[PDB]
Structure 1
Amino acid sequence: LLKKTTGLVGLAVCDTPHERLTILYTKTLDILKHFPKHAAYRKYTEQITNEKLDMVKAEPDVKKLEALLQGGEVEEVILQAEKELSLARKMLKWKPWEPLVEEPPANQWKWPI
């Protein structure tokens, strides 16, 4: 059937959770393909995105898919996929795979003094 409410205020109920998750994960993979090959963020985020896309394609049941993904409810999973896509764009802009920008001073992290 269809979920009456998600139990969280301000979160709508998605009547098509599989298609939305599929297109979000596909967009995430497509924007991750622009990353450099040696980017650890690209490798890891591709790992989670591929695993979650495989699990979504494997499980057609909404409740069993939520229990498999264990990231709360499927609306929360959709929101997390949206935030992961935005984070992937922000990582692509910021380029954090570069070496360390500037070494800290010698006693910057020495505790106690």
Structure 2
Amino acid sequence: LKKTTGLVGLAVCETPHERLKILYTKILDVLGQIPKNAAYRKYTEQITNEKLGMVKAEPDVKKLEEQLQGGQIEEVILQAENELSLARKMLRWKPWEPLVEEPPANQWKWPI
């Protein structure tokens, strides 16, 4: 097994595949709680499905890390946790709704 993740504060996970699968399934459920036409749901579902398929395809940890291109597998697990938290927050924010308000006249004009 890997002795250390290299990064300080990041511990080696003895079960990376199972944890990744669980996190991806949770992310997919939370996205399924989101309206379909929203771009966030579509994009995140595509990314999560790709990553979950890659996880299921390769049992080798190092080959899976190389295929994911997300760094070490523990970094991938942390990314999945952050994505799950982001999806849960976006469920409350609901950014798929139209723009709150247009900028007031010449608000983004440069130079003066």
Structure-2 separation of matches of 1:88 and 1:52:
16
Residue 38 of structure 2 corresponds to residue 39 of structure 1: yes
Paired with 1:66 and 1:37, the residues of 2 have a C-alpha distance of 30
In structure 2, the partner of 1:19 is 18
In 2: Cα distance, 1:86 partner to 1:37 partner: 19
List aligned pairs for 1:1-113, cutoff 5 A.
2-113=1-112
CA–CA distance in structure 2, aligned partners of residues 87 and 31 of structure 1 = 10
Normalised by the length of structure 2, the TM-score is 0.99
Paired residue total: 112
Q: Deviations over 1:33-75 (max 9, x none)?
A: 0100111000000000000000000010000000000111000
Q: TM-score, structure 1 length as denominator?
A: 0.98
CA distance in 1, matches of 2:77, 2:29: 17
Deviation at 1:26, TM superposition (A): 0.3
Distance 2:46 2:5 in 1: 28
Unaligned runs of 5+ in 1: none
2: CA distance, partners of 1:108 / 1:72: 41
Percent pairwise identity: 87
Structure 1 residue 106: deviation in Å?
1.2
Distance (whole Å) between structure 2 residues aligned to residue 53 and residue 47 of structure 1? 10
How far apart are the structure 2 equivalents of 1:111 and 1:33?
A: 42
Q: Distance in 2 between matches of 1:56 and 1:37?
A: 25
